[PDB]
């Protein structure tokens, strides 16, 4: 979608810190969908014990299996509405 690339833009230009503080879940959702969308199914090696953040990211992404690139695109957008909705209610 053009929408996906727009969503991605919004998120990329956000401030690193701010009034909303995203959950780890929220972060891993956006991260995994984004990888599924841009790189496809996770086929890289999984990071080791000394890289915990790498392991979480990988598990999230791998969890998506063989989800199509369109599938992940529209789920990214759905997650954006989800979080946007949380921010609106603050
Ligand atoms: C949610 C909607 C927004 C608001 C809705 C609007 C309506 C509401 C109205 C209210 C108005 C009030 C305004 C208040 C808003 C601010 C409040 C909050 O504090 S807001 C601010 C709170 N702070 C925020 O949440 C900040 C969120 N944004 C950021 O944190 C950064 O852009 C970043 C994390 C994506 C890093 O960028 P970068 O320079 O690349 O640094 P790294 O390379 O280290 O990134 C590492 C990995 O991430 C991967 N990846 C890349 N792009 C995306 C993507 N779009 N997605 C997912 N993943 C993406 C990338 O491929 C890489 O993979 P790998 O190679 O490691 O495997
Ligand atoms: C409105 C908020 C937008 C958020 C965009 C997040 C972008 C994705 C990249 C960040 C990687 C997530 C790593 C989190 C590790 C979790 C640690 C743990 O669960 O204790």
GROMACS .gro file of N, CA and C and ligand atoms in nm:
model
  357
    1UNK      N    1   0.084  -0.118   0.000
    1UNK     CA    2   0.000   0.000   0.000
    1UNK      C    3   0.087   0.123   0.000
    2UNK      N    4   0.027   0.234  -0.043
    2UNK     CA    5   0.084   0.366  -0.022
    2UNK      C    6   0.064   0.399   0.125
    3UNK      N    7  -0.042   0.343   0.182
    3UNK     CA    8  -0.075   0.365   0.322
    3UNK      C    9   0.036   0.314   0.412
    4UNK      N   10   0.080   0.192   0.386
    4UNK     CA   11   0.188   0.133   0.464
    4UNK      C   12   0.310   0.224   0.469
    5UNK      N   13   0.361   0.262   0.352
    5UNK     CA   14   0.475   0.352   0.346
    5UNK      C   15   0.449   0.484   0.418
    6UNK      N   16   0.323   0.529   0.420
    6UNK     CA   17   0.287   0.649   0.497
    6UNK      C   18   0.297   0.625   0.647
    7UNK      N   19   0.235   0.516   0.692
    7UNK     CA   20   0.241   0.475   0.831
    7UNK      C   21   0.387   0.469   0.877
    8UNK      N   22   0.466   0.391   0.805
    8UNK     CA   23   0.609   0.382   0.827
    8UNK      C   24   0.676   0.519   0.841
    9UNK      N   25   0.638   0.614   0.756
    9UNK     CA   26   0.688   0.752   0.767
    9UNK      C   27   0.654   0.819   0.899
   10UNK      N   28   0.526   0.817   0.934
   10UNK     CA   29   0.481   0.871   1.062
   10UNK      C   30   0.571   0.821   1.175
   11UNK      N   31   0.592   0.689   1.178
   11UNK     CA   32   0.666   0.626   1.285
   11UNK      C   33   0.814   0.662   1.280
   12UNK      N   34   0.867   0.677   1.159
   12UNK     CA   35   1.009   0.706   1.148
   12UNK      C   36   1.044   0.846   1.193
   13UNK      N   37   0.953   0.940   1.170
   13UNK     CA   38   0.974   1.080   1.208
   13UNK      C   39   0.929   1.117   1.348
   14UNK      N   40   0.870   1.023   1.421
   14UNK     CA   41   0.837   1.049   1.560
   14UNK      C   42   0.962   1.087   1.641
   15UNK      N   43   0.941   1.153   1.756
   15UNK     CA   44   1.051   1.184   1.847
   15UNK      C   45   1.090   1.055   1.919
   16UNK      N   46   1.217   1.039   1.958
   16UNK     CA   47   1.261   0.917   2.026
   16UNK      C   48   1.196   0.904   2.163
   17UNK      N   49   1.180   1.017   2.231
   17UNK     CA   50   1.109   1.024   2.358
   17UNK      C   51   0.991   1.119   2.349
   18UNK      N   52   0.893   1.100   2.436
   18UNK     CA   53   0.774   1.181   2.428
   18UNK      C   54   0.665   1.138   2.524
   19UNK      N   55   0.550   1.203   2.511
   19UNK     CA   56   0.439   1.184   2.602
   19UNK      C   57   0.379   1.042   2.599
   20UNK      N   58   0.381   0.974   2.484
   20UNK     CA   59   0.343   0.832   2.479
   20UNK      C   60   0.464   0.744   2.499
   21UNK      N   61   0.448   0.638   2.577
   21UNK     CA   62   0.554   0.539   2.594
   21UNK      C   63   0.501   0.402   2.552
   22UNK      N   64   0.542   0.355   2.431
   22UNK     CA   65   0.494   0.233   2.365
   22UNK      C   66   0.528   0.112   2.448
   23UNK      N   67   0.440   0.012   2.455
   23UNK     CA   68   0.473  -0.111   2.525
   23UNK      C   69   0.576  -0.188   2.444
   24UNK      N   70   0.640  -0.286   2.507
   24UNK     CA   71   0.731  -0.375   2.437
   24UNK      C   72   0.653  -0.451   2.332
   25UNK      N   73   0.534  -0.498   2.370
   25UNK     CA   74   0.445  -0.562   2.275
   25UNK      C   75   0.424  -0.475   2.151
   26UNK      N   76   0.386  -0.349   2.175
   26UNK     CA   77   0.355  -0.256   2.066
   26UNK      C   78   0.475  -0.245   1.977
   27UNK      N   79   0.590  -0.228   2.040
   27UNK     CA   80   0.713  -0.214   1.964
   27UNK      C   81   0.736  -0.340   1.879
   28UNK      N   82   0.725  -0.458   1.941
   28UNK     CA   83   0.755  -0.584   1.873
   28UNK      C   84   0.655  -0.613   1.763
   29UNK      N   85   0.528  -0.577   1.786
   29UNK     CA   86   0.429  -0.579   1.677
   29UNK      C   87   0.472  -0.499   1.553
   30UNK      N   88   0.491  -0.368   1.569
   30UNK     CA   89   0.542  -0.285   1.461
   30UNK      C   90   0.670  -0.346   1.399
   31UNK      N   91   0.763  -0.390   1.483
   31UNK     CA   92   0.890  -0.440   1.431
   31UNK      C   93   0.869  -0.566   1.345
   32UNK      N   94   0.796  -0.663   1.399
   32UNK     CA   95   0.780  -0.789   1.328
   32UNK      C   96   0.701  -0.767   1.199
   33UNK      N   97   0.589  -0.696   1.205
   33UNK     CA   98   0.516  -0.673   1.080
   33UNK      C   99   0.604  -0.604   0.976
   34UNK      N  100   0.686  -0.510   1.021
   34UNK     CA  101   0.768  -0.431   0.929
   34UNK      C  102   0.871  -0.517   0.859
   35UNK      N  103   0.925  -0.617   0.930
   35UNK     CA  104   1.024  -0.705   0.871
   35UNK      C  105   0.957  -0.800   0.775
   36UNK      N  106   0.845  -0.856   0.816
   36UNK     CA  107   0.767  -0.942   0.729
   36UNK      C  108   0.737  -0.868   0.598
   37UNK      N  109   0.700  -0.740   0.610
   37UNK     CA  110   0.665  -0.660   0.493
   37UNK      C  111   0.782  -0.631   0.402
   38UNK      N  112   0.897  -0.599   0.460
   38UNK     CA  113   1.006  -0.543   0.381
   38UNK      C  114   1.108  -0.648   0.341
   39UNK      N  115   1.117  -0.754   0.419
   39UNK     CA  116   1.216  -0.858   0.396
   39UNK      C  117   1.159  -0.997   0.375
   40UNK      N  118   1.031  -1.014   0.408
   40UNK     CA  119   0.969  -1.145   0.398
   40UNK      C  120   0.991  -1.228   0.523
   41UNK      N  121   0.972  -1.359   0.510
   41UNK     CA  122   0.976  -1.448   0.626
   41UNK      C  123   1.115  -1.451   0.683
   42UNK      N  124   1.123  -1.471   0.814
   42UNK     CA  125   1.250  -1.468   0.882
   42UNK      C  126   1.330  -1.596   0.850
   43UNK      N  127   1.444  -1.579   0.782
   43UNK     CA  128   1.533  -1.689   0.747
   43UNK      C  129   1.680  -1.662   0.784
   44UNK      N  130   1.703  -1.558   0.864
   44UNK     CA  131   1.837  -1.530   0.914
   44UNK      C  132   1.861  -1.607   1.044
   45UNK      N  133   1.988  -1.622   1.084
   45UNK     CA  134   2.012  -1.695   1.209
   45UNK      C  135   1.961  -1.618   1.330
   46UNK      N  136   1.928  -1.689   1.436
   46UNK     CA  137   1.883  -1.624   1.558
   46UNK      C  138   2.004  -1.588   1.643
   47UNK      N  139   2.003  -1.465   1.700
   47UNK     CA  140   2.108  -1.408   1.787
   47UNK      C  141   2.123  -1.491   1.914
   48UNK      N  142   2.240  -1.480   1.977
   48UNK     CA  143   2.269  -1.565   2.090
   48UNK      C  144   2.233  -1.504   2.224
   49UNK      N  145   2.270  -1.574   2.330
   49UNK     CA  146   2.241  -1.528   2.464
   49UNK      C  147   2.285  -1.384   2.491
   50UNK      N  148   2.400  -1.344   2.437
   50UNK     CA  149   2.454  -1.212   2.475
   50UNK      C  150   2.390  -1.096   2.397
   51UNK      N  151   2.281  -1.126   2.327
   51UNK     CA  152   2.208  -1.024   2.253
   51UNK      C  153   2.058  -1.041   2.271
   52UNK      N  154   2.009  -1.014   2.392
   52UNK     CA  155   1.869  -1.033   2.431
   52UNK      C  156   1.771  -0.953   2.344
   53UNK      N  157   1.805  -0.830   2.312
   53UNK     CA  158   1.714  -0.751   2.232
   53UNK      C  159   1.702  -0.813   2.092
   54UNK      N  160   1.816  -0.850   2.034
   54UNK     CA  161   1.818  -0.930   1.912
   54UNK      C  162   1.731  -1.057   1.920
   55UNK      N  163   1.742  -1.132   2.029
   55UNK     CA  164   1.656  -1.249   2.045
   55UNK      C  165   1.506  -1.216   2.048
   56UNK      N  166   1.467  -1.112   2.120
   56UNK     CA  167   1.325  -1.073   2.121
   56UNK      C  168   1.278  -1.033   1.982
   57UNK      N  169   1.358  -0.951   1.914
   57UNK     CA  170   1.321  -0.905   1.781
   57UNK      C  171   1.301  -1.024   1.688
   58UNK      N  172   1.395  -1.118   1.694
   58UNK     CA  173   1.393  -1.235   1.607
   58UNK      C  174   1.272  -1.321   1.634
   59UNK      N  175   1.248  -1.352   1.761
   59UNK     CA  176   1.131  -1.433   1.797
   59UNK      C  177   1.002  -1.371   1.747
   60UNK      N  178   0.990  -1.239   1.762
   60UNK     CA  179   0.871  -1.168   1.715
   60UNK      C  180   0.852  -1.188   1.564
   61UNK      N  181   0.956  -1.158   1.489
   61UNK     CA  182   0.955  -1.168   1.345
   61UNK      C  183   0.930  -1.312   1.304
   62UNK      N  184   1.010  -1.405   1.357
   62UNK     CA  185   0.990  -1.545   1.325
   62UNK      C  186   0.850  -1.595   1.355
   63UNK      N  187   0.784  -1.532   1.452
   63UNK     CA  188   0.655  -1.580   1.495
   63UNK      C  189   0.555  -1.568   1.381
   64UNK      N  190   0.584  -1.480   1.285
   64UNK     CA  191   0.489  -1.451   1.176
   64UNK      C  192   0.483  -1.559   1.065
   65UNK      N  193   0.580  -1.650   1.066
   65UNK     CA  194   0.584  -1.759   0.971
   65UNK      C  195   0.594  -1.714   0.826
   66UNK      N  196   0.503  -1.766   0.742
   66UNK     CA  197   0.507  -1.734   0.599
   66UNK      C  198   0.398  -1.635   0.560
   67UNK      N  199   0.361  -1.549   0.654
   67UNK     CA  200   0.265  -1.442   0.626
   67UNK      C  201   0.306  -1.360   0.502
   68UNK      N  202   0.212  -1.337   0.412
   68UNK     CA  203   0.240  -1.261   0.290
   68UNK      C  204   0.278  -1.116   0.320
   69UNK      N  205   0.347  -1.054   0.225
   69UNK     CA  206   0.392  -0.917   0.237
   69UNK      C  207   0.275  -0.817   0.247
   70UNK      N  208   0.163  -0.851   0.184
   70UNK     CA  209   0.041  -0.770   0.191
   70UNK      C  210  -0.021  -0.787   0.327
   71UNK      N  211  -0.027  -0.913   0.370
   71UNK     CA  212  -0.078  -0.946   0.502
   71UNK      C  213  -0.010  -0.861   0.611
   72UNK      N  214   0.122  -0.859   0.611
   72UNK     CA  215   0.196  -0.785   0.711
   72UNK      C  216   0.177  -0.634   0.693
   73UNK      N  217   0.177  -0.588   0.568
   73UNK     CA  218   0.148  -0.446   0.545
   73UNK      C  219   0.019  -0.402   0.612
   74UNK      N  220  -0.092  -0.469   0.582
   74UNK     CA  221  -0.220  -0.429   0.638
   74UNK      C  222  -0.227  -0.450   0.792
   75UNK      N  223  -0.148  -0.543   0.846
   75UNK     CA  224  -0.148  -0.560   0.990
   75UNK      C  225  -0.068  -0.448   1.055
   76UNK      N  226   0.034  -0.400   0.987
   76UNK     CA  227   0.111  -0.286   1.036
   76UNK      C  228   0.016  -0.169   1.053
   77UNK      N  229  -0.059  -0.142   0.948
   77UNK     CA  230  -0.157  -0.036   0.950
   77UNK      C  231  -0.260  -0.056   1.060
   78UNK      N  232  -0.303  -0.180   1.079
   78UNK     CA  233  -0.403  -0.207   1.181
   78UNK      C  234  -0.348  -0.180   1.321
   79UNK      N  235  -0.218  -0.204   1.337
   79UNK     CA  236  -0.151  -0.184   1.465
   79UNK      C  237  -0.135  -0.035   1.494
   80UNK      N  238  -0.116   0.041   1.387
   80UNK     CA  239  -0.102   0.184   1.394
   80UNK      C  240  -0.234   0.245   1.440
   81UNK      N  241  -0.345   0.192   1.391
   81UNK     CA  242  -0.472   0.249   1.428
   81UNK      C  243  -0.494   0.216   1.574
   82UNK      N  244  -0.454   0.095   1.610
   82UNK     CA  245  -0.468   0.045   1.745
   82UNK      C  246  -0.400   0.137   1.846
   83UNK      N  247  -0.273   0.169   1.820
   83UNK     CA  248  -0.195   0.252   1.908
   83UNK      C  249  -0.242   0.398   1.899
   84UNK      N  250  -0.259   0.448   1.777
   84UNK     CA  251  -0.316   0.581   1.756
   84UNK      C  252  -0.439   0.600   1.842
   85UNK      N  253  -0.522   0.496   1.847
   85UNK     CA  254  -0.645   0.500   1.924
   85UNK      C  255  -0.612   0.520   2.071
   86UNK      N  256  -0.503   0.459   2.118
   86UNK     CA  257  -0.463   0.470   2.259
   86UNK      C  258  -0.418   0.612   2.291
   87UNK      N  259  -0.340   0.668   2.200
   87UNK     CA  260  -0.292   0.804   2.214
   87UNK      C  261  -0.408   0.903   2.213
   88UNK      N  262  -0.504   0.883   2.124
   88UNK     CA  263  -0.617   0.973   2.119
   88UNK      C  264  -0.690   0.977   2.254
   89UNK      N  265  -0.688   0.865   2.326
   89UNK     CA  266  -0.759   0.852   2.453
   89UNK      C  267  -0.671   0.885   2.572
   90UNK      N  268  -0.597   0.995   2.564
   90UNK     CA  269  -0.506   1.037   2.671
   90UNK      C  270  -0.526   1.186   2.707
   91LIG     C1  271   0.156   0.561   1.646
   91LIG     C2  272   0.099   0.678   1.565
   91LIG     C3  273   0.152   0.820   1.590
   91LIG     C4  274   0.056   0.929   1.644
   91LIG     C5  275  -0.088   0.928   1.588
   91LIG     C6  276  -0.152   1.061   1.544
   91LIG     C7  277  -0.287   1.099   1.608
   91LIG     C8  278  -0.286   1.129   1.759
   91LIG     C9  279  -0.291   1.278   1.797
   91LIG    C10  280  -0.205   1.323   1.916
   91LIG    C11  281  -0.106   1.437   1.890
   91LIG    C12  282   0.001   1.455   2.000
   91LIG    C13  283   0.142   1.418   1.953
   91LIG    C14  284   0.216   1.320   2.045
   91LIG    C15  285   0.304   1.216   1.974
   91LIG    C16  286   0.434   1.184   2.050
   91LIG    C17  287   0.416   1.102   2.180
   91LIG    C18  288   0.512   0.982   2.182
   91LIG     O1  289   0.621   1.006   2.266
   91LIG     S1  290   0.564   0.942   2.010
   91LIG    C19  291   0.741   0.901   2.019
   91LIG    C20  292   0.778   0.778   2.104
   91LIG     N1  293   0.894   0.713   2.044
   91LIG    C21  294   0.873   0.626   1.930
   91LIG     O2  295   0.805   0.531   1.944
   91LIG    C22  296   0.983   0.622   1.824
   91LIG    C23  297   0.947   0.531   1.708
   91LIG     N2  298   1.038   0.544   1.595
   91LIG    C24  299   1.171   0.495   1.627
   91LIG     O3  300   1.190   0.450   1.735
   91LIG    C25  301   1.270   0.478   1.513
   91LIG     O4  302   1.221   0.532   1.393
   91LIG    C26  303   1.313   0.333   1.493
   91LIG    C27  304   1.309   0.252   1.623
   91LIG    C28  305   1.225   0.269   1.387
   91LIG    C29  306   1.459   0.337   1.447
   91LIG     O5  307   1.487   0.404   1.325
   91LIG     P1  308   1.643   0.380   1.275
   91LIG     O6  309   1.707   0.504   1.231
   91LIG     O7  310   1.646   0.262   1.156
   91LIG     O8  311   1.713   0.323   1.414
   91LIG     P2  312   1.734   0.159   1.399
   91LIG     O9  313   1.795   0.122   1.250
   91LIG    O10  314   1.818   0.115   1.510
   91LIG    O11  315   1.590   0.075   1.397
   91LIG    C30  316   1.598  -0.064   1.426
   91LIG    C31  317   1.508  -0.164   1.353
   91LIG    O12  318   1.369  -0.119   1.330
   91LIG    C32  319   1.335  -0.148   1.200
   91LIG     N3  320   1.247  -0.043   1.149
   91LIG    C33  321   1.282   0.063   1.076
   91LIG     N4  322   1.165   0.139   1.053
   91LIG    C34  323   1.059   0.074   1.116
   91LIG    C35  324   0.918   0.107   1.125
   91LIG     N5  325   0.867   0.227   1.063
   91LIG     N6  326   0.838   0.027   1.190
   91LIG    C36  327   0.887  -0.087   1.251
   91LIG     N7  328   1.025  -0.120   1.243
   91LIG    C37  329   1.107  -0.037   1.175
   91LIG    C38  330   1.459  -0.146   1.119
   91LIG    O13  331   1.442  -0.211   0.997
   91LIG    C39  332   1.559  -0.215   1.211
   91LIG    O14  333   1.559  -0.354   1.197
   91LIG     P3  334   1.693  -0.442   1.232
   91LIG    O15  335   1.803  -0.419   1.110
   91LIG    O16  336   1.743  -0.401   1.365
   91LIG    O17  337   1.654  -0.603   1.234
   92LIG     C1  338   0.373   0.481   1.868
   92LIG     C2  339   0.499   0.396   1.889
   92LIG     C3  340   0.576   0.339   1.769
   92LIG     C4  341   0.682   0.232   1.798
   92LIG     C5  342   0.779   0.184   1.689
   92LIG     C6  343   0.882   0.076   1.729
   92LIG     C7  344   0.982   0.031   1.622
   92LIG     C8  345   1.041  -0.109   1.629
   92LIG     C9  346   1.188  -0.126   1.664
   92LIG    C10  347   1.220  -0.148   1.811
   92LIG    C11  348   1.263  -0.288   1.852
   92LIG    C12  349   1.190  -0.347   1.971
   92LIG    C13  350   1.278  -0.404   2.082
   92LIG    C14  351   1.208  -0.431   2.214
   92LIG    C15  352   1.271  -0.535   2.306
   92LIG    C16  353   1.181  -0.586   2.419
   92LIG    C17  354   1.247  -0.613   2.554
   92LIG    C18  355   1.162  -0.691   2.656
   92LIG     O1  356   1.058  -0.738   2.622
   92LIG     O2  357   1.196  -0.682   2.792
   0.00000   0.00000   0.00000
